[PDB]
Amino acid sequence: ITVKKLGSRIGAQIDGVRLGGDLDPAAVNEIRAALLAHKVVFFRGQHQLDDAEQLAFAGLLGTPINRWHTDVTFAANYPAASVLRAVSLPSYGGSTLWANTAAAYAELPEPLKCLTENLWALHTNRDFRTEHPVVRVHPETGERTLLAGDFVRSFVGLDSHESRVLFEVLQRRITMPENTIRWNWAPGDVAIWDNRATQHRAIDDYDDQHRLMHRVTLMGDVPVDVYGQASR
Amino acid sequence: ITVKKLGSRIGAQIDGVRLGGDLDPAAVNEIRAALLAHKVVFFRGQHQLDDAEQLAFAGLLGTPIKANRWHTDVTFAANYPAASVLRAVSLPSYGGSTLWANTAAAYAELPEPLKCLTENLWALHTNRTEHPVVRVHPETGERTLLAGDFVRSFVGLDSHESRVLFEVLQRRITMPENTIRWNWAPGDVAIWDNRATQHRAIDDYDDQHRLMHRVTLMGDVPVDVYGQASRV
Amino acid sequence: ITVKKLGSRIGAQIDGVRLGGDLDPAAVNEIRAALLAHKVVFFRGQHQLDDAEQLAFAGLLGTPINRWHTDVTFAANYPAASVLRAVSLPSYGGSTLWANTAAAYAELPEPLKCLTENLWALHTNRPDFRTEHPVVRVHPETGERTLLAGDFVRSFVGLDSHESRVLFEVLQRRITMPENTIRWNWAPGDVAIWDNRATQHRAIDDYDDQHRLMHRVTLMGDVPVDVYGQASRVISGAPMEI
Amino acid sequence: ITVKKLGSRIGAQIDGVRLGGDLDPAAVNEIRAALLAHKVVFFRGQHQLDDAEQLAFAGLLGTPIANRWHTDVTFAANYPAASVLRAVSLPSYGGSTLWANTAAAYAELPEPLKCLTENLWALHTNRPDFRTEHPVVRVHPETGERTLLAGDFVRSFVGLDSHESRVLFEVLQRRITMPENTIRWNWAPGDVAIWDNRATQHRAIDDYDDQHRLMHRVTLMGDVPVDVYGQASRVIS
Ligand SMILES: O=C(O)CNC(=O)C(=O)O
Ligand SMILES: O=C(O)CNC(=O)C(=O)O
Ligand SMILES: O=C(O)CNC(=O)C(=O)O
Ligand SMILES: O=C(O)CNC(=O)C(=O)O
Ligand code: NI
Ligand code: NI
Ligand code: NI
Ligand code: NI
């Protein structure tokens, strides 16, 4: 099971793997290890995956159930990761972006660290309304990762202007091209992204063409800040 | 001799042509027509090209005259170049992709208030030349935005206003739906209409050396909607 | 009769005028003249002026009905002017700010004029008033073009949240710039009258939790029109009456 | 000596004292106690002040050495502590001056913004090429209060890029210069303002057209700022 690097801070393709229920435990752990490090991983030539087969593979990794976002952060226990498969693609366009929120935190100056560490945001669908920290400690890897995205409505104890301004400041660093991967989809492609340490965005640049994408989301946990305080 | 669409607002790939001086006038008309329409065009497997053959080809288009920040080339100069012919000589093992943006579509998709603004707005480009923010393209006749990283300020506006407005325009230009991100492979050639485009390198390949052979053409002096030339 | 200027772009004090309901017609014109030119005018030592007398005086100018704002712009026919009298003031602080929106427009770069002339804003209270106003309205009397924004603004039509707030703050910065504002320190028995169709105003909460009371009388206004001559659109709620 | 308050966060007027070099220690201690507390203090009815008499009174406070919000000469490391400004020739109208309380500004920062500012450093320049790196928060030598340090001289913040510098700068300046945290003095003849430059910003207002305006100032010697952790400012040039 080889793992080719795609970008400096994010992205890695994986070859010599046939996804499915019949997978070797050691093979699954290497995928899990590659996922945590590279934040998003890709598998090409997976034309054997139907809905039932993709569900089986997701069962090994975890537990099954446009604008820059982390999936369903308005919820308290937002999902850990997702497995997305291309089934029907447009003849042009329809790529997807991913950002590394772990490297986003790491490359902050110390003042912006002090800021984000003690800053809390209100995530909502704009009626679920969760209060998340802007920096969560990743339970598995132990990395500190920024938590924001389009669901963010405001920051706690902070006015509209300051919330809006700081939000875009943080988003500017997260989405900065050097910290992102843009995947050109093809038939039989499968993406897996760690939702605890990523942000993603669909690109609506295929006009009025159809584009079906069968996703399988895994079960998530409640974030905690550097001090160890849960969301509310 | 076909040309296929890559994105809704930008990007095309021209397959079925060997780039060189031998190409007939009809072939150049296909390339030019695609280039003006699609703003950036790409060729695949141009292994025959070197420096001499590429320079000979570039001469058919016009007269041959870090970059990790959204820019139009040499806009600090008055008669900045029309288009460029960039070729992959040697690439990194991973990353080293390039972004493109359609500044013609950007203008066309402006609300009328912002059209009012940009048509009448002027920017100071430097590393000192006053360009208009909207210029009329001398072939297609399309109004296209002219900004980028070389802009220090806007004429009539102060530091705050200049920046705040500058961000607003660049947010629309560099919007992902208005961009193509090329993954360079050996023997790839990209040609972009520097008049009607904006581009950006991505330093997502650590300390790996990336050599790119560019041939930039002769360009004309901008004029705004009123036909006013760029002062110096 | 005397009209002392306070600032370059806004503000004027008017002495030798006892405000009342039996004021001379020519004296009302002198006041109205200054109010149009100086946008806000001030009167001192008006101890006799009670509530009953204030309403009578207000009836001469027109028809009787904290963050930078123009009063009740969530409504379509928002007031033309107001008459604020000081009845109870704190021991310190509690001043009020005014901004000249006619001069604000006048001193826009041509690009920002181009923008604002064609720009429209949604004003709302959150009762459920929602009104689309032109950002630049033509003043009926003076014929001057004046910026119409303020706290009641919610979004600009056609633009997204980021652009709206960005451009909103750019305009508000020019409107509320110190060189374009007056700051009145209230003394007992003072009166302020402002042209609401060519001003924004702001209370300053810099007197802690203290008592501050001032009775107001608001004059009925008209529905704004842009430079093209297009009336403001009403989404929800009715116009103001009486 | 009576000392009336002007605003809740800033400003105070002091009556019952004629400014001069022959003031009793007790009197000057009250004037300073007022200055420290209220940031800026005003002395009306001082039509008798000569330049020499102004310099005399200034010598009791310390050692004798523009239409944008600034702290005087923050491009220098040991920038002035306070100044005593006097009106000599005023316009027919306008010409007021603004003052902000940068001590109260810091205090009212949410916990996140304290984190930011406490660890943030700025480059102050004169655009002579005095270039200094100050902390965005300094501990005041006398009061012990933490005050925001910025103004027009700030070229950028250390660690942050151009966009982030400007954005965050403007966020701070908005909080500092918020009307609730400001005092706007209407200059009358024979008025004297005294502001604590270590705990304030100020701004001239060009709202007197092109009229003649003359102001005579006596600035006092100040110390080098030190952040919460206790690190002095660095002279780059
Ligand atoms: O790739 C895409 O189209 C984006 N997918 C998602 O946002 C998602 O699965 O939540
Ligand atoms: O392709 C790249 O890396 C960017 N090229 C340029 O900015 C250029 O040729 O001017
Ligand atoms: O003067 C003040 O304190 C503010 N008054 C108003 O906003 C008003 O009357 O609408
Ligand atoms: O009083 C003014 O207009 C401004 N004064 C100063 O900026 C100063 O004394 O440093
Ligand atoms: Ni998603
Ligand atoms: Ni370039
Ligand atoms: Ni009001
Ligand atoms: Ni000064």
Coordinates of N, CA and C in Angstrom, one line a residue, chain D residues 24-196:
Chain D
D24 N 2.1 75.0 45.1 CA 2.4 74.2 46.3 C 2.5 72.7 45.9
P25 N 3.3 71.9 46.6 CA 3.4 70.5 46.3 C 2.1 69.8 46.3
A26 N 1.3 70.1 47.4 CA 0.0 69.5 47.6 C -1.0 69.8 46.4
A27 N -0.9 71.0 45.8 CA -1.7 71.3 44.7 C -1.3 70.5 43.4
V28 N 0.0 70.4 43.2 CA 0.5 69.7 42.0 C 0.2 68.2 42.1
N29 N 0.2 67.7 43.3 CA -0.1 66.3 43.5 C -1.6 66.0 43.2
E30 N -2.5 66.9 43.4 CA -3.9 66.8 43.1 C -4.1 66.8 41.5
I31 N -3.3 67.8 40.9 CA -3.4 67.9 39.5 C -2.9 66.7 38.7
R32 N -1.9 66.0 39.3 CA -1.3 64.8 38.7 C -2.2 63.6 39.0
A33 N -2.7 63.5 40.2 CA -3.7 62.5 40.6 C -4.9 62.5 39.7
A34 N -5.3 63.8 39.3 CA -6.4 63.9 38.4 C -6.0 63.5 37.0
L35 N -4.8 63.9 36.6 CA -4.3 63.6 35.2 C -4.3 62.1 35.0
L36 N -3.7 61.4 36.0 CA -3.5 59.9 35.9 C -4.9 59.3 35.8
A37 N -5.8 59.7 36.6 CA -7.2 59.1 36.7 C -8.0 59.4 35.4
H38 N -8.0 60.7 35.0 CA -9.0 61.1 34.0 C -8.3 61.2 32.6
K39 N -7.0 60.9 32.5 CA -6.3 60.8 31.3 C -6.0 62.2 30.7
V40 N -7.0 63.0 30.5 CA -6.8 64.4 30.1 C -7.5 65.3 31.1
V41 N -6.9 66.5 31.4 CA -7.5 67.4 32.3 C -7.4 68.8 31.7
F42 N -8.4 69.6 31.9 CA -8.5 70.9 31.3 C -8.6 72.0 32.3
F43 N -7.8 73.1 32.1 CA -7.8 74.3 32.9 C -8.3 75.5 32.1
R44 N -9.5 75.9 32.4 CA -10.1 77.1 31.7 C -9.7 78.3 32.5
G45 N -9.8 79.5 31.8 CA -9.6 80.8 32.4 C -8.1 81.0 32.8
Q46 N -7.2 80.6 31.9 CA -5.8 80.7 32.1 C -5.2 81.7 31.0
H47 N -5.7 82.9 31.0 CA -5.4 83.9 30.0 C -4.1 84.5 30.3
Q48 N -3.5 84.2 31.4 CA -2.3 85.0 31.9 C -1.0 84.2 31.6
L49 N -1.1 83.1 31.0 CA 0.1 82.2 30.8 C 1.0 82.8 29.7
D50 N 2.2 83.1 30.1 CA 3.3 83.3 29.2 C 3.9 81.9 28.8
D51 N 4.7 81.9 27.7 CA 5.5 80.7 27.3 C 6.4 80.3 28.5
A52 N 7.1 81.3 29.1 CA 8.0 81.0 30.2 C 7.2 80.5 31.4
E53 N 6.0 81.0 31.6 CA 5.2 80.6 32.7 C 4.6 79.2 32.5
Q54 N 4.4 78.9 31.2 CA 3.9 77.6 30.8 C 5.0 76.6 31.0
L55 N 6.2 76.9 30.6 CA 7.4 76.1 30.8 C 7.7 75.8 32.3
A56 N 7.4 76.8 33.1 CA 7.7 76.7 34.5 C 6.8 75.7 35.2
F57 N 5.5 75.7 34.9 CA 4.5 74.8 35.5 C 4.8 73.4 35.0
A58 N 5.2 73.3 33.7 CA 5.6 72.0 33.1 C 6.7 71.3 33.8
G59 N 7.7 72.1 34.3 CA 8.8 71.6 35.0 C 8.5 70.9 36.4
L60 N 7.3 71.2 36.9 CA 6.8 70.5 38.1 C 6.3 69.1 37.8
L61 N 5.8 68.9 36.5 CA 5.3 67.6 36.1 C 6.4 66.7 35.6
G62 N 7.4 67.2 34.9 CA 8.4 66.4 34.4 C 9.6 67.3 33.8
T63 N 10.3 66.7 32.8 CA 11.4 67.3 32.2 C 11.0 67.8 30.8
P64 N 11.0 69.1 30.5 CA 10.8 69.6 29.1 C 11.8 69.1 28.2
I65 N 11.4 68.7 27.0 CA 12.3 68.1 26.0 C 13.1 69.2 25.3
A66 N -2.4 67.5 11.6 CA -2.3 66.3 12.5 C -3.8 65.7 12.8
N67 N -4.5 65.5 11.7 CA -5.9 65.2 11.7 C -6.2 63.7 11.8
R68 N -5.2 62.9 12.4 CA -5.4 61.5 12.5 C -5.1 61.1 13.9
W69 N -5.8 60.0 14.4 CA -5.6 59.5 15.8 C -4.1 59.0 15.9
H70 N -3.4 59.6 16.9 CA -2.0 59.3 17.2 C -1.7 59.5 18.6
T71 N -0.6 58.8 19.0 CA 0.1 59.1 20.3 C 1.4 59.8 19.8
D72 N 1.8 60.9 20.5 CA 2.8 61.7 20.0 C 4.2 61.0 20.0
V73 N 4.8 60.9 18.8 CA 6.1 60.5 18.6 C 6.4 59.1 19.2
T74 N 5.5 58.2 18.8 CA 5.7 56.8 19.2 C 6.7 56.1 18.3
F75 N 7.1 56.8 17.2 CA 8.2 56.3 16.4 C 9.5 56.3 17.2
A76 N 9.6 57.1 18.3 CA 10.7 57.1 19.2 C 10.4 56.1 20.3
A77 N 11.4 55.5 20.9 CA 11.3 54.5 22.0 C 10.9 55.1 23.3
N78 N 11.7 56.1 23.8 CA 11.3 56.9 25.0 C 10.5 58.1 24.6
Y79 N 9.2 57.8 24.2 CA 8.3 58.8 23.7 C 7.7 59.6 24.9
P80 N 7.2 60.8 24.7 CA 6.8 61.7 25.8 C 5.7 61.0 26.7
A81 N 5.8 61.5 28.0 CA 4.9 61.0 29.0 C 3.5 61.8 28.9
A82 N 3.6 63.1 28.9 CA 2.5 64.0 28.8 C 2.9 65.3 28.1
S83 N 1.9 66.1 27.8 CA 2.1 67.4 27.2 C 1.1 68.4 27.7
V84 N 1.5 69.7 27.8 CA 0.7 70.8 28.2 C 0.5 71.7 27.0
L85 N -0.7 71.7 26.4 CA -1.0 72.4 25.2 C -1.9 73.6 25.7
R86 N -1.6 74.8 25.0 CA -2.3 76.0 25.4 C -2.8 76.7 24.1
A87 N -4.0 77.3 24.1 CA -4.5 78.1 23.0 C -4.1 79.5 23.1
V88 N -3.5 80.0 22.0 CA -3.0 81.4 21.9 C -3.8 82.1 20.9
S89 N -4.1 81.5 19.7 CA -4.9 82.1 18.7 C -5.8 81.1 18.1
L90 N -7.1 81.3 18.2 CA -8.1 80.3 17.8 C -8.9 80.7 16.6
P91 N -9.5 79.8 15.9 CA -10.4 80.2 14.7 C -11.7 80.8 15.2
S92 N -12.5 81.2 14.2 CA -13.8 81.8 14.4 C -14.8 80.7 14.8
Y93 N -14.6 79.5 14.4 CA -15.4 78.3 14.7 C -14.6 77.1 14.4
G94 N -15.0 76.0 15.1 CA -14.4 74.7 15.0 C -13.0 74.7 15.6
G95 N -12.2 73.6 15.3 CA -10.8 73.5 15.7 C -10.8 72.8 17.1
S96 N -11.7 71.9 17.3 CA -11.8 71.1 18.5 C -10.8 69.9 18.4
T97 N -10.5 69.3 19.6 CA -9.5 68.2 19.6 C -10.1 67.0 20.4
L98 N -9.8 65.8 19.9 CA -10.3 64.6 20.5 C -9.2 63.9 21.3
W99 N -9.7 63.2 22.3 CA -8.8 62.4 23.2 C -9.5 61.0 23.5
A100 N -8.7 59.9 23.4 CA -9.1 58.6 23.7 C -8.4 58.0 24.9
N101 N -9.1 57.2 25.7 CA -8.5 56.6 26.9 C -8.1 55.1 26.5
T102 N -6.8 54.9 26.3 CA -6.3 53.7 25.8 C -6.2 52.7 26.9
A103 N -6.3 53.2 28.2 CA -6.3 52.3 29.4 C -7.6 51.6 29.5
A104 N -8.7 52.4 29.3 CA -10.0 51.8 29.4 C -10.3 50.9 28.2
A105 N -9.7 51.3 27.1 CA -9.8 50.5 25.8 C -9.4 49.0 26.1
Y106 N -8.2 48.9 26.7 CA -7.6 47.6 27.0 C -8.5 46.8 28.0
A107 N -8.9 47.5 29.0 CA -9.7 46.9 30.1 C -11.0 46.3 29.6
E108 N -11.6 46.9 28.6 CA -12.9 46.5 28.1 C -12.7 45.5 26.9
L109 N -11.5 45.1 26.6 CA -11.3 44.1 25.6 C -11.8 42.7 26.2
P110 N -12.6 42.0 25.4 CA -12.8 40.5 25.7 C -11.5 39.8 25.9
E111 N -11.6 38.7 26.6 CA -10.4 37.9 27.0 C -9.6 37.6 25.8
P112 N -10.2 37.1 24.7 CA -9.4 36.8 23.4 C -8.6 38.0 22.9
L113 N -9.1 39.2 23.0 CA -8.4 40.4 22.4 C -7.3 40.9 23.4
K114 N -7.4 40.5 24.6 CA -6.3 40.7 25.6 C -5.1 39.8 25.2
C115 N -5.4 38.5 25.1 CA -4.5 37.6 24.6 C -3.7 38.1 23.4
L116 N -4.4 38.6 22.4 CA -3.9 39.1 21.1 C -2.9 40.2 21.5
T117 N -3.4 41.3 22.1 CA -2.7 42.5 22.3 C -1.6 42.4 23.2
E118 N -1.7 41.6 24.3 CA -0.7 41.4 25.3 C 0.6 40.8 24.6
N119 N 0.4 40.0 23.6 CA 1.5 39.3 22.9 C 1.9 39.9 21.6
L120 N 1.1 41.0 21.2 CA 1.3 41.6 19.9 C 2.3 42.8 20.0
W121 N 3.1 42.9 19.0 CA 4.1 44.0 18.9 C 3.9 44.7 17.5
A122 N 4.2 46.0 17.5 CA 3.9 46.9 16.4 C 5.2 47.6 16.0
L123 N 5.4 47.9 14.7 CA 6.5 48.7 14.2 C 6.0 50.1 14.0
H124 N 6.6 51.0 14.8 CA 6.3 52.5 14.7 C 7.4 53.2 13.9
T125 N 7.0 54.0 12.9 CA 8.0 54.6 12.1 C 7.5 56.1 11.9
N126 N 8.5 56.9 11.4 CA 8.2 58.3 11.2 C 8.0 58.6 9.7
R127 N 8.0 57.5 8.9 CA 7.7 57.6 7.4 C 8.7 58.6 6.8
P128 N 16.0 62.1 9.2 CA 15.6 61.3 10.4 C 14.8 60.1 10.0
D129 N 15.2 58.9 10.5 CA 14.6 57.6 10.3 C 14.5 56.9 11.6
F130 N 13.6 57.3 12.5 CA 13.3 56.7 13.7 C 12.3 55.6 13.6
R131 N 12.8 54.3 13.8 CA 12.0 53.1 13.6 C 12.1 52.3 14.9
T132 N 11.0 52.0 15.6 CA 10.9 51.4 16.9 C 9.9 50.3 16.9
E133 N 10.1 49.2 17.6 CA 9.2 48.1 17.8 C 8.6 48.2 19.2
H134 N 7.4 48.7 19.4 CA 6.7 48.8 20.6 C 5.8 47.6 20.8
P135 N 5.5 47.3 22.1 CA 4.4 46.3 22.4 C 3.0 47.1 22.2
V136 N 2.0 46.3 21.8 CA 0.7 46.9 21.7 C 0.0 47.1 23.0
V137 N 0.5 46.5 24.1 CA 0.1 46.8 25.4 C 1.4 47.1 26.3
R138 N 1.3 48.3 26.9 CA 2.4 48.7 27.9 C 1.8 48.8 29.2
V139 N 2.6 48.5 30.3 CA 2.2 48.7 31.7 C 2.6 50.1 32.0
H140 N 1.6 50.9 32.5 CA 1.9 52.3 32.8 C 2.8 52.4 34.1
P141 N 3.9 53.3 34.0 CA 4.8 53.3 35.1 C 4.2 53.8 36.5
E142 N 3.3 54.7 36.4 CA 2.8 55.3 37.7 C 1.5 54.6 38.2
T143 N 0.5 54.4 37.3 CA -0.8 53.9 37.7 C -0.7 52.4 37.8
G144 N 0.1 51.8 36.9 CA 0.3 50.3 36.8 C -0.8 49.7 35.9
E145 N -1.6 50.5 35.3 CA -2.7 50.1 34.4 C -2.1 49.8 33.0
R146 N -2.7 48.8 32.3 CA -2.3 48.4 31.0 C -3.0 49.2 30.0
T147 N -2.3 49.8 29.0 CA -2.9 50.7 28.0 C -2.5 50.2 26.6
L148 N -3.4 50.4 25.7 CA -3.2 50.1 24.3 C -2.2 51.1 23.7
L149 N -1.3 50.6 22.8 CA -0.3 51.4 22.2 C -0.3 51.2 20.7
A150 N -0.8 52.2 20.0 CA -0.9 52.1 18.5 C -0.8 53.5 17.9
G151 N -1.8 54.0 17.2 CA -1.8 55.3 16.5 C -1.4 55.2 15.1
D152 N -1.2 56.4 14.5 CA -1.0 56.6 13.0 C 0.4 56.1 12.6
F153 N 1.3 56.1 13.6 CA 2.7 55.8 13.3 C 3.0 54.4 13.1
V154 N 2.0 53.5 13.5 CA 2.1 52.1 13.3 C 2.2 51.7 11.8
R155 N 3.3 51.1 11.4 CA 3.5 50.7 10.0 C 2.9 49.3 9.8
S156 N 3.1 48.4 10.8 CA 2.6 47.1 10.7 C 2.8 46.4 12.1
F157 N 2.2 45.2 12.2 CA 2.4 44.4 13.4 C 3.4 43.2 13.1
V158 N 4.2 42.9 14.1 CA 5.3 41.9 13.9 C 4.7 40.5 13.9
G159 N 5.0 39.8 12.8 CA 4.5 38.5 12.6 C 3.4 38.4 11.6
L160 N 2.6 39.4 11.5 CA 1.4 39.4 10.6 C 1.7 40.1 9.3
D161 N 1.0 39.8 8.2 CA 1.2 40.3 6.9 C 0.5 41.7 6.8
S162 N 0.4 42.2 5.6 CA -0.2 43.5 5.3 C -1.7 43.6 5.6
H163 N -2.4 42.7 5.1 CA -3.9 42.6 5.3 C -4.2 42.5 6.7
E164 N -3.5 41.5 7.4 CA -3.8 41.2 8.8 C -3.5 42.4 9.7
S165 N -2.4 43.1 9.4 CA -1.9 44.2 10.2 C -3.0 45.3 10.1
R166 N -3.4 45.7 8.9 CA -4.4 46.7 8.7 C -5.7 46.4 9.4
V167 N -6.2 45.2 9.1 CA -7.5 44.7 9.6 C -7.5 44.8 11.2
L168 N -6.5 44.2 11.8 CA -6.5 44.1 13.3 C -6.2 45.5 13.9
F169 N -5.4 46.3 13.2 CA -5.1 47.7 13.6 C -6.4 48.4 13.7
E170 N -7.3 48.3 12.6 CA -8.5 49.1 12.5 C -9.5 48.6 13.6
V171 N -9.4 47.3 14.0 CA -10.3 46.7 15.0 C -10.0 47.3 16.3
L172 N -8.7 47.5 16.6 CA -8.3 48.2 17.9 C -8.7 49.6 17.9
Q173 N -8.4 50.3 16.8 CA -8.6 51.8 16.7 C -10.1 52.1 16.8
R174 N -11.0 51.2 16.4 CA -12.4 51.3 16.5 C -12.8 51.3 18.0
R175 N -12.2 50.4 18.7 CA -12.6 50.3 20.2 C -12.0 51.5 21.0
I176 N -10.8 51.9 20.6 CA -10.1 53.0 21.3 C -10.9 54.3 21.1
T177 N -11.3 54.6 19.8 CA -11.8 55.9 19.4 C -13.4 55.9 19.4
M178 N -13.9 54.8 20.1 CA -15.4 54.7 20.2 C -15.9 56.0 21.0
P179 N -16.9 56.7 20.5 CA -17.4 57.9 21.2 C -17.5 57.9 22.7
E180 N -17.9 56.7 23.2 CA -18.1 56.5 24.6 C -16.7 56.7 25.4
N181 N -15.6 56.4 24.7 CA -14.3 56.4 25.3 C -13.5 57.6 24.8
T182 N -14.2 58.7 24.5 CA -13.5 59.9 23.9 C -14.1 61.2 24.6
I183 N -13.3 62.3 24.5 CA -13.7 63.6 24.9 C -13.3 64.6 23.9
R184 N -14.3 65.5 23.5 CA -14.1 66.4 22.5 C -14.1 67.9 23.0
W185 N -12.9 68.5 23.1 CA -12.8 69.8 23.8 C -13.0 70.9 22.8
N186 N -13.9 71.8 23.2 CA -14.1 73.1 22.4 C -13.2 74.1 23.0
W187 N -12.2 74.5 22.2 CA -11.2 75.5 22.6 C -11.7 76.9 22.7
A188 N -11.6 77.4 23.9 CA -11.9 78.8 24.2 C -10.6 79.5 24.5
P189 N -10.4 80.8 24.4 CA -9.2 81.5 24.8 C -8.8 81.3 26.2
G190 N -7.5 81.0 26.4 CA -6.9 80.8 27.7 C -7.3 79.5 28.3
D191 N -7.4 78.5 27.5 CA -7.7 77.1 27.9 C -6.3 76.4 27.9
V192 N -6.2 75.4 28.8 CA -5.0 74.6 28.8 C -5.4 73.1 29.0
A193 N -4.9 72.2 28.1 CA -5.2 70.8 28.1 C -3.9 70.1 28.6
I194 N -4.0 69.1 29.4 CA -2.9 68.2 29.8 C -3.3 66.8 29.7
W195 N -2.7 66.0 28.8 CA -3.0 64.6 28.6 C -1.9 63.7 28.9
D196 N -2.2 62.5 29.4 CA -1.3 61.5 29.7 C -1.0 60.7 28.4

